[PDB]
Symmetry: C3
Subunit: 364 residues, 3 copies
Amino acid sequence: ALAATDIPGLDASKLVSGVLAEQRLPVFARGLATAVSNSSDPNTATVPLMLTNHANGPVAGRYFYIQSMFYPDQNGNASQIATSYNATSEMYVRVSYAANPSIREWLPWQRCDIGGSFTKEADGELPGGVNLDSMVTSGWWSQSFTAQAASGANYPIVRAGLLHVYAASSNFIYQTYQAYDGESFYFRCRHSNTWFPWRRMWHGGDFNPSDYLLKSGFYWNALPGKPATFPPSAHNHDVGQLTSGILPLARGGVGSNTAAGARSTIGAGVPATASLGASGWWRDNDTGLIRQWGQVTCPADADASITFPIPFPTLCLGGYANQTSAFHPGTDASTGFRGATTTTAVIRNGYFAQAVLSWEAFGR
Amino acid sequence: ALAATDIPGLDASKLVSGVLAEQRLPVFARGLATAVSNSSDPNTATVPLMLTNHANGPVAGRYFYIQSMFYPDQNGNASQIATSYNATSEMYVRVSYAANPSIREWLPWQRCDIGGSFTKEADGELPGGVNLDSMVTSGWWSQSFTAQAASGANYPIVRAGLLHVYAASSNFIYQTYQAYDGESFYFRCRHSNTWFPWRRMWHGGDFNPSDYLLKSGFYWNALPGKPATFPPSAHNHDVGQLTSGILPLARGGVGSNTAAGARSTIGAGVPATASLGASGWWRDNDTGLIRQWGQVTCPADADASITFPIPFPTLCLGGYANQTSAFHPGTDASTGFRGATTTTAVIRNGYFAQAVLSWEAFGR
Amino acid sequence: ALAATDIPGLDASKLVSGVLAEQRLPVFARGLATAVSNSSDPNTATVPLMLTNHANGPVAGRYFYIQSMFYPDQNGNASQIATSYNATSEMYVRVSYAANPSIREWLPWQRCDIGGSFTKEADGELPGGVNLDSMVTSGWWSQSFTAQAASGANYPIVRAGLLHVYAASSNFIYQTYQAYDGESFYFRCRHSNTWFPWRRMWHGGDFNPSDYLLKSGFYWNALPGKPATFPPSAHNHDVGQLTSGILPLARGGVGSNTAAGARSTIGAGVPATASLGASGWWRDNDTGLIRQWGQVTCPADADASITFPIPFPTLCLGGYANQTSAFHPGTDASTGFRGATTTTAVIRNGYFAQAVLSWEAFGR
Ligand SMILES: [Ca+2]
Ligand SMILES: [Ca+2]
Ligand SMILES: [Ca+2]
Ligand SMILES: [Fe+3]
Ligand SMILES: [Mg+2]
């Protein structure tokens, strides 16, 4: 009976049929990350799969499965894909390329999973009680509940809304917040670990500048509600500015616009008129009484007629005559006034010689 | 003479040279995703490559190729990379780690292709006719034509511009729009399937607050255009405030500032004056007429001189005398008045005895 | 001794123990990308690993390692993962699916690393001297120093701050800038290689609209500081608005509110009164002088008493009588007036017949 020790070394071509049992394969070809110790340096990888927490992996302190692909041999250029062993689901990629492929020049790991990016799904829903000062990593988050903004801290407004964080660096953490109801849009920055105040955008829902007065519209003629007239300050006047009415006696006026009315107000009379010649008259125009006078030559013991300087308008009321000469006192030298009309009267001379007699008459 | 049945079981070390035909390999080592049925659970994977649409894959209802990497054996902890079988090009990663590695604890799948991210390339160009209410998927899009905004619906402004969509959830869809010409920046949100109005940012192109009147600038002294004088409302005056001019008769005045002028205006006379004693005088100061009177003791049949109480300024015009006694009526008792100057006259007594005669004279 | 040429072809099941030397594996199972040439076409891939710069790879001109996973066989549907060979660390994925799997239909390569995405890490820190017009690639950058903004160009404000770039297309490059201190938020766009000016957001740190006057608050009654009285413009009055005071003669008044005082001011007299009948009286009310007259029938050579029309208030100053008839001139016809009281007097008739004598009397 033949034993294995009798069989010489064979070329792989001697296997002409069948599929090898998986245990016959090097472990990396079964997907087992067990060919090298779990602290192996991925920089010196020569098998296509290892598991290691070595520092040259993508995240210091963490184990990653590291796939390697090689050209032109397992010591040469390589591409590596790293996937996480626990805690999170992450992927990284890197490459070594060099003119002498065996003297590797590794580039830094580049992240593949979208955990390293701004994602089309929000990073998370914010629960209650969140202090936005604690949101210091880049991303965007949704607060779906106004009451959870109320129970949190450093929200710019008590409203559901969208938070963006742009963590530029440790000393410049930018945030924006868009309120769900458009209350406004806010922004702030943590600068060297101290937060600036939120800035609140002014928008068209807040106010319309057309509701406010331009400086160019601020002037007297534009001011509505102005009264037609204004209560005056103390002032004097020229009498010319008195243009209607009639001043009464109570104010030192004559209470009339006619001379007659004025005279009645102050109880005044009118001027008398006269012609005060040798033959003359005088007239009281208050009453119309007229007195007249003249002289006449009379014959001895006889009459002479006189004509009054002016006619009496209605009648002569009376008269007398007087001897103007040095009549002989041994005889009568009587006089008479009689027969008066509106225009004439008769003067009687009782003296026994031609004589000049003066006379007076009165009437109306 | 040797057939295969004569050869004993061999150790893999007996293959000392050559490269196996790939058909000798388990199918997963050939890139063939055929080792397990295409509905197999990736959670229970033990081969490094499978193809399955099982629900525990990354996208519901879709086939993915799933690569698996294991430690410390194929039943233990694992890392998996899923890649799509059709429709789109997508990649995912996940991991199972457990203290007892055979009791797996899988973490959620994380996406790797940039389809899950906001990318440096815009998501698309918006054509004409787009209703922005329909843009409810996260991303950013560009409208390159104002005319294509004009043919659409629910653009905040008819302008080319940049649309961001942040679909936090179907209950909260946020949008922003930046007009290409800086007309403004807009934001809004769809809450519970109803869109709030676009909010429009106010910016420096719209207005400058310095053009508007501050409340603190609104007061009487600052109001420009105020008139120097104002139309007065109805008011009363004291006559003392009439400081110039002369009131005319039409207004109840006397049309003059002199006594004589005032009398002229109202046609008034002046007072008569008198001394009304037993001998006396009376003067009409309107005309200048003077009447005087007195008494005189005359000698029998002779003259007596009289002196007028006051001189006549110019001349005596006339006079008479009257017997004051009970003269015997059997003789003449005539009288005469004659020879009058401005100061004196001659009274003649025709009675045969001494007698008292009264007299009157008038003149001017 | 047996030679290898004596051993017949063997089934893979003849290996019952041990692990193959890795050099017995097809090269791709070792991670060696050498099974096909570096010009091989990935569209026609039948091996699970290659390295090629063929045009059908993900980036023209560049070598990528390409893994292939196949179903149902190596000519059929396939998923491919490509990882970079040099220069950078990049990954892509694609797929071929067709109802007839051998007539392949390849979908476009899709990037898997975050290098083509908006990353949670900022693209970079801006140094000094940067012209922001040069930043036309999508991303976000941080200016950590205000002094480095001051040395640059086309910053919207000389302030540290956060720059975003959205390069929608060559014809539209959008930028936003958030100041670190919240000075404001800015945006602009480069359209057809011309940058619009930055727009500057108005926010609550800039001003508050409640400091400005609403047009609805701009009216007369609301204006503060208004005087209580106003200097009047020229106006006229009705004398009815002269409610107090007494106009003096200097202003055309009578200087009094009594008739007597007004007369005194202008030196006017009062009206005379009279009863100008056949017998009657006349009275100068300036002085009180009264004149009266009448007629009386006397016996021959005898007295007759008269009663004055009215009593003299104080005394009769004088009188006379006059013959009214054509007395015989051959005799005496003297008259007398005497014995006057306030009410009566005595008229003497020296004519030797009954005769009518008229009389006058005066007094006060
Ligand atoms: Ca005688
Ligand atoms: Ca005679
Ligand atoms: Ca006788
Ligand atoms: Fe006035
Ligand atoms: Mg008078």
